[PDB]
Amino acid sequence: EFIAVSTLARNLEIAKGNEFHTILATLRSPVYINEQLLKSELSFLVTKILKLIRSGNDFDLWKGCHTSVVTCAYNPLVLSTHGGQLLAAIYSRLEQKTGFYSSVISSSHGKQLFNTLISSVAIIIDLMKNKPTLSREALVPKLKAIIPTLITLSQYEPELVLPVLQRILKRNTTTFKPFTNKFRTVLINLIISDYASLGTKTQRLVCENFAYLHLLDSNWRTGLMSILSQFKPIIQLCGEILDFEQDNELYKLIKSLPEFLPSLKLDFNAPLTLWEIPQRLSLLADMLVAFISLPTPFPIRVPLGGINSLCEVLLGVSNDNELNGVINTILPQIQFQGIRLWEIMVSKYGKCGLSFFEGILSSIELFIPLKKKSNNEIDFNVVGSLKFEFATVFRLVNMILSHLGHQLNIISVISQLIEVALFLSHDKTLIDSLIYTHPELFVCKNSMNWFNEINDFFITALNNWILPSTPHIQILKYSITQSLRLKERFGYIPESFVNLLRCEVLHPGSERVSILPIAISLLKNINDDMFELLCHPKVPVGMVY
Amino acid sequence: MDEQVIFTTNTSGTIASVHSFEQINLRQCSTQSRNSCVQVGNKYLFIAQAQKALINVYNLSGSFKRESVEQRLPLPEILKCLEVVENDGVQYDRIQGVNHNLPDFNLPYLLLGSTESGKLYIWELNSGILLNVKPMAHYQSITKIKSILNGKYIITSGNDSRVIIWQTVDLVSPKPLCILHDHTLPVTDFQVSSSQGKFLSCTDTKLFTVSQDATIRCYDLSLIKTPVLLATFTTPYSIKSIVLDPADRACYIGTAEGCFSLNLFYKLKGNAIVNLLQSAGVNTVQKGRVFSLVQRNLYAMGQLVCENVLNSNVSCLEISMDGTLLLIGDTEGKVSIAEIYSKQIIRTIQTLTVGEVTNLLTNPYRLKIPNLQRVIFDGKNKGHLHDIWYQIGEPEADFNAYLEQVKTQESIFSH
């Protein structure tokens, strides 16, 4: 019946994996909430855990914090009785173990130790927020001393600490107040660094925490407009090399735009130093994304026309020897920071900004690299580098057409994007400029996780447009050939191609004849129920009574 | 890409693609049966010989196909009919998608084979094990067997004018589900809709049945119950064979003195178009309409206009993946590739080395085996090890993810 929790406690001071995991697993059971073991047996377990955490060989500590986490999560009485004492012990060990950091990270287990301690503190103070009476008198006299330690530790371990301070700053905006300057310093020291040794997650977290720093109606607006105003100097610095006023409607808009960062220097004899310009614009875009896409405890003014104008002027930036070669690569990356901002302005706000959904699609044509000589032809060698960016473009288009829907008039950007997507759907080879008797082994074959993205884009195109003939026949040939190839290689057809053939059957558009019976010939032993309804239709849905 | 025709006469084994004008005559083949050939596991072709009591096995995977017999398979009895139950739903790895390639060794689960006097032999193919033998199912013969869904149900037809629907789990571990006596003379063929679902409760699956009674009977299959017919037609000529369009838009019937067509979405003289086959799930009336066919030389009299395509004494029919070409086998041992609309032959395939076209097949394509056990039955033993031969097949095996790995890596160094 009952597993005698004293037995778990006494077998816990020594327990390796295949015993310790059973101890943690059986302690989930709710029958340890019951009369007259609530003052004499849980006390024994908690004193055992406390003796494990208070002094140990750094294995009993890891074991102990995991044990307290599981116990407090699956038993609210242990929380309401002893959570303050457990959290005090864990914070004390964290404090002594972060008083030194370069003698505690010396053995490849200090990192995991900080991970488990920080995670355990976070989990405890994420369960003591559903109890007002308990968030008093166990956390609030302790956060004043918890938070400076976490700040000092975030200088070295931002990937692990910053979500905790983010949640604490968000749920408590009045105890983080007198430490706020001390936080800001470290965040400017983490942005003044190279800022590419940090991951995307860490970059986003420092941006988000700097954004939530300004919670202390109006300060959010000041920080937001400061970051928005730090865009125009960089663009005018880029305008001394692209020679604007060749097109004046752009230069009218550039001067129509409205601080801790260094004013940067550029040298043309060292063209690699031109990689500072994208690596500042991406930074400011991340900070802007943080100020915009985050939740708040109050509403906020967000300028949408301003950032739309900013995105519009970013994608206008396009068309001694190696310098020209380096200029031919930074500019797509510059445009992509307009793409990356419209993708967040679209999904998070949705139909707000419906007015801008037609200009974005026209401006995406500027992102496409054309051949240099005079022509409207696509430069496929540049497109081979830009794969992730064009995937982001495809997701942006699919985000827009969820709201716009089917479109009467057609535009030219979609046909060029289809040509791009059909180029990217071909198995790349990188020996074409020239063997060793086998040039077919030097290919980069396209996974199915990429074909899914391409096929979702073609679904969006065939749904909402009556396309021209040749950009339709290419799609049909692609779908049929690849489906047959995969049905030979495999014994089946993946689901994205089936969805593509479904859309090709349902939405033929300008065609005078469907591809229905060929889809069924391919779907011979892979049956599906869409075409049953099409060929063998059903009685309506209310005739039955 | 192109389509591939595998047809065999009583003394000839030709294989040829439709748009290639190249062909391979298999050396040793003999048949006097209507449907006796099958293509097994995209690596093999099985043909049941006549008057030898064995199956010939040809390897058809090569770039230069094996003209000769790759292998033989003796049997207990000479048997006429064949059908295969293809294994599906094993290559995706539904637990997590890895999209396994096919192995070099693949096989189906079953090999249905039926002989004269109505006996049915079914064999596991991964290991030759005769799981079950039904001594008598039809009481004169069997002429065609087909698995309509993947391995779920199989349908049989013989010369007792009864078409039987089994259930594969109730046949291999028999008491069939339903029997169909609506014909009076031997049922020579049937066909089922190429468009199908995963189940029968939410589909209306059409079964066309054809006999020497000069009738064509269209049955609605949706059970959960018995099937209900909703139309039957009638013919002046002794009908022999039948195929459908790949979407159940038409019917094409092969018979003595020509091959005839029939539109199922029948267009009247008001620009009014009537679907003869309308139905639902299990709720459906039993009032099967009657109509009669008459050639070309408006339907409330009980007559319908079939359009004559050809004048050849056809034995068998098949259809292309487009749904626009018929491949018809005459009694002079040659195939005609014809176009449905214009009624103009485009190609004529003969064999080179004679009897009629026994059977033929088509599927599109792009540019050892166990011995069968003669009278042995795997019983209710549990200590028996039901060993099979099997192979799984490898799974299919960018840069921004690599750079993100690099960015996460760089933080650990203080240098």
Binding site: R512, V513, S514 | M1, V18, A247, T324, E339
Partner: peptide, 24 residues
């Protein structure tokens, strides 16, 4: 007129070029 019916012209699906082989 209807896309999902048998058309009234002889060679449909000739403009998809599935079965053609281009000469090089």
């Amino acid at each position: 007129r209807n896309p999902y019916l048998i058309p009234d012209y002889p060679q449909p699906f000739e403009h998809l070029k599935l079965f053609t082989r281009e000469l090089k």
